[PDB]
């Protein structure tokens, strides 16, 4: 389960940043090796991003801070 | 990677850039071999190759091979893709004219020559001798030479002369234009003018001058002496089955070119006469042009072939350029469609997908995922493994589908929930399963409607589906904030039924101590599903703020309401389920559940209403009997009452009592109130004839009827549906629009007659006929609308601006019929709101209005409300977030990069398919008070208003105004100010036959010049039935005493000169014709005297012509400056209608026509937005005399009452969207610091205006004044000339933009679609910004 779109667009409130702050995340994701900091309940990197949006566990420094530490 | 796509003039020296090599030969290709053939149209020595990597000859055919070029035969070894690329070029030994630059609306080569269009043809074509540099000679440069007059030139003169015919001519006029010189000239002699005709052909030849000096365009290119070749690929001459040959319209065009350039290359070197060579000149002329553009003065070549021709103008216009084409519609892949079918058991979020579809649509994805799990070593072996279809691919197939939503769309879309994306399930068929809850959305039925799929590929597309596109996301109309996913008639019929309590039913009065026992009871069969019983519930109550508090309570209700409660949200009580569940009252549920408990346990409640109405509707079995539509036994009285009523008037049609119209009116009026006594006593029978008994008696209830179910639930069928079924059926229409006499008595059950039926035939084909309309002309005007607002969107956070339009509730009629309930609801207030105290305001600034505020402004008085509007707004190239609001499928308000220009378009289009006085009296009680009515107290104790720019309004005890009347000149007021009306009783009276007048003071007054034999004339009725003055007409009277006209002379009692305060001439004025004084020469009354009695479209096309502003047929004539008006001269054939001001020194005289019956008298004052001719007003003058504020007003509210009446409602924000497009243009009125008379721009005028300011000048003379423009003049205001080519004339707006160097940035939607770039709206807003922060800055 744990698949909430409404959660995680609550903290935001913009519909378009969430799209472009999970697509940064998704990648690190499916390319590169990077470990998400949620379980894996078999689903795909497009839709486990999102739960770290809306958890509360990344953010818009987060995803940069990881991101600069494999380059 | 690319901004600023320039355009402009090509220059012959990089024409010759562009090429690759001459093309000399007029051949294609061999005979023998097909091989293209050296210096030819095509040639892989000027092009590229024609196979992958290989020369013509053969000595170079490999991949380490590519900067060799062979020296026998071969060619440049390139990867035979780069023939699109490739082009060549004609050196023409005669320069030839562009036809683009000389015939269209303006002259390019006329006006910069200041030379005739006709006269320019003629030099062209080698008829006549033009002079170049004339100098000391005798004629001018505008004066041209014969063939009998050119030989005397070199005669007389000798020297200082040079005289050329031709192309050549017309290239050596444009060698020595002096660019910059004769502007210079054009500078000092524009002001000596005074005529218009004059300064719009001085300046329009002035700001030609100007673009061919900053841009770079040199005149000289505007004649041509070398021409570019098309790529052969995009002119591909490929093969057919049986050896047969294709090719294009362009190669035989290209082809007579060089036949003709060749040939004129061969008559030069063989000194031939210049009688011969003029000749072959001229034909490189039409040859060229023809090859350009086809449809000009040169006929196009029409051999063996019906249509003329298609050349290079004719592939980007035409309906069918290449440009347009594209922007209607273009194929991609991942795609697919079949037929859709209902599944009752999915989720909201999901839908249904054949196995034979997710096969093809995912293949790539499979062919990734066989290799990646070592099931595959290859591609070629993994695509073997789908053919086979074997096992191991179905888990693999169900696993690339598991998060990877589809895109589902219908092939109408009308509106923004045309495309939704949903989960897609593997089921097995070949019909798409869908959702019965979004079949709203898409308006598709089940009666072979197909939809198509679409796969979104990366996961920039797989988050937009799933974040924006969803099908749950969208759960809110975009128009309006009423839910669009709500139980269809199926559910709806399920949830009625359940909750329907009855008189006596089985298991009546017991109670329950829980809602798990109500469950149990039911299903043991010991209970009925609807009984009077009473059962313990424990609720949760969200109305405090962050407290769920939980109650427990024993509520009195039936079964079926206790089993409905088991599926609703925590967060809501239970006097929701209380009620009959309507369709009208579970659309507010769910809009009341998305409010309170959110987004997430909405959408998993929807889902659990359609599943508990699809239960319940089962185990009822309703069904449509013929015992069902029950007739009225008093039906057979009226109908046989009403024909014996027709039979005794048709008996006084034969003795002449009643003439023809007047018995059609009567028997129209007749059976027009039969059939309403009809229809009220078959409802009467319908809804109470259910009969039960309580321990013994026979007590009426609501009739358990399947009939009458389905239209008190809404399901389907409305009162004008089942009337044709029980009841008489009515009078008919006519194509004609006229209605027969003869009605049909008889319904649908009981069937009709032969002459019956085919009287309904006419009405079912016009309705049928005029849905081919409805879808033509409706998805015209939304096109227009998304033209004009495309452009449009949220760019700004706060805009910081007070002004704002002020919202009242519609108070016209008895009641509001729409109060400020949803007139304010998700609006930014502008400006405080103040109570009728003292210091003392509601809201605190700017706040946006929810649910929690409008019971808030319920509670008090306020009425008056300033919002926010886009009309009103500050901010330039977009919209502000807080001006907008925030009625949208979301609870927030507007995010930035949000299109609100868009939505607003198709909010207003969708719903076109739809489309096609002598007394007042006050309904309710309260006080009555008068805004804007100046009044004269007479000394009976009545009132007489003098003016009507004011109305009556009734105040509510709590100081709001509910009723509001207006009242003509002249109107009696019985009822005094500040008094408690009676409901039900007159406050003041009027006259709409004859117009009333008022006088100023009291006095003895007569007629002056009335002798009654020539201006007046004495008129006396049967018995002395008219005993007064009456007026005679102006035909009817002499010739001599045509120019006196009867007037009313006003003086005292004591002899003194009354005269009128704030007017110098007194109060004189004239009586008109067909005119009676009640008052005696001499005798008069003291006040409210009536001297003179003056006597006295709709639906799809007229919100069509009310966006374009257009002018009525007749317009209304209005007042400019407030003050007395008078007339003129009536027998010369127009109405001077003067006006002096009593307030400013300013006379202003204006005509009026005669034809137009004139509603104003003489000697009375006027004000500014008064009317004084009855009729219907353009927007435009109401917007110069009154101001954008009134504008508004009159644009929204008239076009919400053509949807109003309709049933549909469409938010105001949607309409003064599209207003603040066309209110966008403006005018100057005077002349000094613009360019030409015309008006720009209020974004660029705005921005002048304070450099001016705060510079080198102190004042600011240059104003402006608000025009308006309508939805097809507004859109052509585009600073783009890539998307000005679409919805315009490509051929128009490429010459225009060419010979000014306009470059064209890609700052809108419609210029990022067919180039290929990310559009600035939405989540591509993230894209741009990011590249401006890093362009102009570090
Ligand atoms: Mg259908
Ligand atoms: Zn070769
Ligand atoms: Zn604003």
Redesign the interface.
């Known amino acids: 389960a744990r698949v909430?779109?409404?959660?995680c667009?609550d903290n935001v409130?913009?519909?378009?940043?969430?799209?472009?702050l999970?697509?940064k995340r998704?990648?690190q994701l499916?390319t590169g090796g990077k470990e998400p900091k949620v379980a894996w309940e078999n689903?795909?990197?497009?839709?486990v991003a999102?739960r770290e949006i809306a958890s509360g566990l990344v953010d818009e420094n987060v995803v940069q801070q990881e991101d600069i530490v494999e380059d | 990677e690319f901004d600023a796509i320039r355009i402009g003039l090509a220059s012959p020296e990089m024409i010759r850039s562009w090429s690759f090599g001459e093309v000399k030969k007029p051949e294609t290709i061999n005979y023998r071999t097909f091989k293209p053939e050296r210096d030819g149209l095509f040639c892989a020595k000027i092009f590229g190759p024609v196979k992958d990597y290989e020369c013509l000859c053969g000595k170079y055919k490999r991949l380490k091979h590519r900067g060799v070029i062979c020296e026998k035969c071969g060619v440049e070894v390139a990867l035979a893709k780069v023939r699109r690329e490739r082009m060549g070029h004609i050196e023409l030994a005669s320069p030839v004219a562009h036809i683009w630059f000389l015939k269209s609306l303006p002259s390019r080569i006329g006006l910069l020559l200041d030379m005739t269009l006709r006269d320019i043809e003629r030099v062209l074509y080698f008829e006549s001798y033009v002079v170049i540099d004339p100098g000391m000679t005798t004629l001018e440069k505008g004066q041209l030479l014969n063939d009998e007059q050119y030989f005397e030139a070199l005669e007389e003169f000798g020297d200082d002369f040079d005289a050329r015919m031709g192309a050549e001519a017309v290239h050596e006029l444009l060698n020595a234009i002096d660019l910059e010189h004769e502007i210079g000239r054009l500078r000092e002699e524009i002001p000596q003018t005074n005529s218009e005709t004059k300064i719009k052909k001085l300046s329009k030849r002035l700001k030609l001058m100007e673009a061919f000096q900053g841009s770079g365009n040199k005149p000289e290119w505007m004649v041509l002496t070398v021409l570019p070749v098309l790529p052969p690929d995009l002119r591909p001459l490929v093969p057919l089955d049986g050896g047969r040959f294709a090719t294009s319209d362009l190669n035989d065009l290209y082809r007579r070119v060089i036949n003709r350039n060749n040939r004129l290359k061969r008559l030069l070197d063989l000194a031939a006469p210049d009688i011969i060579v003029r000749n072959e000149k001229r034909m490189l002329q039409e040859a060229v042009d023809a090859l350009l553009d086809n449809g000009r003065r040169g006929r196009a070549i029409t051999g063996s072939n019906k249509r003329p021709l298609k050349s290079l103008a004719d592939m980007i216009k035409g309906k069918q350029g290449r440009f347009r084409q594209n922007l209607l519609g273009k194929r991609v892949d991942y795609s697919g469609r079949s037929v859709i079918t209902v599944g009752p058991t999915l989720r909201l979020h999901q839908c249904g997908l054949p196995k034979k579809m997710a096969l093809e649509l995912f293949k790539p994805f499979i062919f990734g995922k066989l290799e990646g799990r070592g099931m595959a070593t290859t591609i070629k072996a993994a695509k073997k493994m789908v053919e086979r279809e074997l096992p191991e691919v179905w888990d693999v197939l169900a696993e690339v589908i598991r998060e990877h939503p589809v895109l589902l769309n219908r092939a109408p879309t009308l509106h923004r929930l045309g495309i939704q994306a949903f989960e897609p399930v593997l089921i097995e068929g070949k019909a798409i399963q869908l959702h019965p809850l979004v079949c709203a959305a898409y308006n598709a039925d089940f009666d072979g409607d197909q939809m198509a799929v679409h796969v979104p590929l990366t996961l920039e597309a797989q988050l937009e589906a799933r974040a924006l596109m969803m099908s749950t996301n969208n759960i809110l109309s975009p128009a309006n904030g009423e839910p669009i996913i709500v139980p269809s008639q199926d559910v709806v019929m399920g949830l009625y039924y359940m909750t329907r309590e009855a008189i006596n039913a089985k298991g009546e009065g017991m109670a329950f101590a829980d809602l798990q026992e109500v469950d149990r009871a039911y299903r043991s069969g010991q209970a009925s599903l609807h009984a009077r019983v009473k059962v313990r519930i424990n609720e949760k109550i969200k109305g405090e703020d962050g407290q769920l508090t939980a109650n427990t309570r024993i509520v009195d209700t039936t079964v079926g309401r206790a089993l409905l409660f088991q599926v609703v949200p925590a967060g809501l009580p239970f006097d929701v389920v209380n009620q009959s569940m309507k369709k009208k009252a579970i659309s507010k549920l769910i809009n009341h559940c998305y409010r309170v408990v959110g987004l997430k346990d909405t959408v998993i409640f929807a889902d659990q209403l359609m599943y508990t109405g699809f239960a319940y509707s089962t185990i009822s079995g309703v069904s449509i009997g013929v015992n069902d539509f029950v007739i009225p036994d008093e039906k057979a009285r009226i109908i046989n009452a009403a024909t014996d009523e027709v039979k005794e008037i048709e008996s006084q049609y034969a003795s002449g009592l009643v003439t023809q119209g007047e018995k059609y009116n009567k028997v129209i009026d007749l059976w027009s109130k039969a059939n309403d006594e009809v229809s009220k006593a078959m409802m009467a029978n319908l809804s109470k004839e259910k009969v039960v008994d309580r321990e013994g008696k026979e007590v009426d209830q609501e009739s358990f009827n399947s009939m009458y179910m389905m239209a008190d639930s809404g399901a389907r069928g409305s009162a004008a549906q089942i009337r044709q079924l029980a009841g008489m059926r009515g009078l008919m229409a006519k194509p004609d629009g006229s209605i027969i006499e003869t009605p049909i008595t008889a319904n649908f059950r009981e069937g009709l007659n032969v002459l019956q039926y085919f009287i309904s035939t006419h009405g079912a084909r016009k309705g049928l006929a005029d849905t081919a309309l409805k879808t033509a002309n409706s998805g015209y005007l939304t096109r227009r609308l998304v033209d004009v607002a495309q452009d449009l969107v949220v760019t700004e956070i706060d805009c910081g601006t007070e002004h704002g339009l002020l919202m009242s509730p519609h108070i016209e009629g008895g009641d509001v019929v729409e109060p400020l309930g949803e007139r304010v609801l998700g609006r930014v207030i502008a400006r405080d709101v103040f109570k009728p105290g003292s210091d003392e305001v509601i809201v605190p600034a700017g706040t946006l209005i929810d649910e929690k505020w409008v019971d808030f402004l319920e509670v008090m008085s306020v009425d008056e409300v300033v919002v926010r509007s886009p009309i009103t707004c500050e901010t330039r190239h977009g919209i502000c977030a807080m001006c907008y609001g925030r009625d949208l499928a979301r609870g927030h308000r507007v995010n930035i990069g949000e299109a609100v220009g868009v939505i607003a378009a198709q909010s207003i289009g969708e719903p076109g398919t739809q489309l096609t006085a002598d007394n007042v009296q006050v309904k309710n009680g309260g006080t009555i008070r008068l805004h804007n009515l100046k009044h004269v107290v007479r000394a009976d104790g009545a009132l007489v208003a003098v003016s009507r720019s004011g109305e009556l309004a009734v105040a509510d005890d709590f100081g709001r105004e509910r009723e509001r009347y207006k009242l003509p000149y002249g109107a009696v007021i019985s009822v005094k100010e500040g008094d408690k009306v009676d409901p039900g009783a007159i406050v003041a009276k009027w006259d709409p036959h004859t117009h009333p007048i008022v006088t100023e003071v009291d006095g003895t007054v007569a007629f002056v010049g009335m002798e009654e034999g020539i201006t007046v004339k004495r008129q006396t009725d049967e018995l002395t039935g008219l005993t007064n003055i009456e007026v005679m007409d102006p035909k009817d009277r002499p010739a001599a005493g045509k120019d006196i006209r009867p007037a009313v002379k006003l003086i005292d009692a004591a002899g003194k000169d009354l005269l009128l305060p704030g007017t110098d001439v007194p109060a004189q004025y004239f009586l008109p014709a067909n005119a009676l004084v009640n008052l005696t020469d001499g005798a008069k009354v003291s006040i409210g005297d009536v001297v003179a009695r003056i006597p006295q479209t709709g639906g799809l096309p007229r919100v069509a012509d009310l966006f374009e502003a257009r002018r009525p047929k007749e317009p209304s004539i209005l007042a400019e400056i407030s003050g007395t008006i008078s007339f003129g001269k009536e027998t010369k054939g127009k109405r001077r209608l003067v006006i002096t001001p009593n307030d400013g020194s300013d006379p202003y005289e204006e005509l009026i026509p005669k034809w137009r019956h004139l509603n104003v008298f003489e000697g009375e004052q006027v004000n500014r937005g008064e009317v004084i001719s009855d009729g219907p007003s353009n927007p435009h003058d109401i917007l110069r005399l009154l101001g954008v504020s009134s504008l508004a007003k009159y644009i929204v509210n008239e076009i919400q009452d053509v949807y109003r009446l309709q049933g549909v409602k469409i938010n105001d924000k949607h309409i003064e969207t599209i207003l603040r497009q066309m209110l966008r243009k403006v005018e100057v009125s005077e002349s000094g610091d613009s360019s030409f008379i015309k008006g720009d721009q209020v974004e660029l005028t705005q921005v002048l205006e304070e450099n001016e300011q705060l510079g080198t000048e102190d004042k600011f003379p240059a104003k402006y004044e608000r025009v308006l423009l309508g939805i097809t003049k507004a859109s052509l205001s585009t600073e783009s000339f890539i998307s000005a080519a679409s919805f315009q004339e490509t051929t128009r707006v490429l010459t225009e933009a060419a010979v000014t160097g306009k470059r064209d940035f890609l700052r809108g939607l419609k210029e990022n679609v067919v180039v290929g770039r990310l559009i600035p709206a939405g989540t591509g807003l993230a894209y741009h910004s990011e590249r401006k922060r890093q362009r102009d800055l570090g």
């Open positions: 909430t779109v409404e959660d667009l409130d913009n519909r378009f940043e969430l799209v472009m999970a697509t998704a990648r499916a689903d795909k990197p497009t839709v999102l």
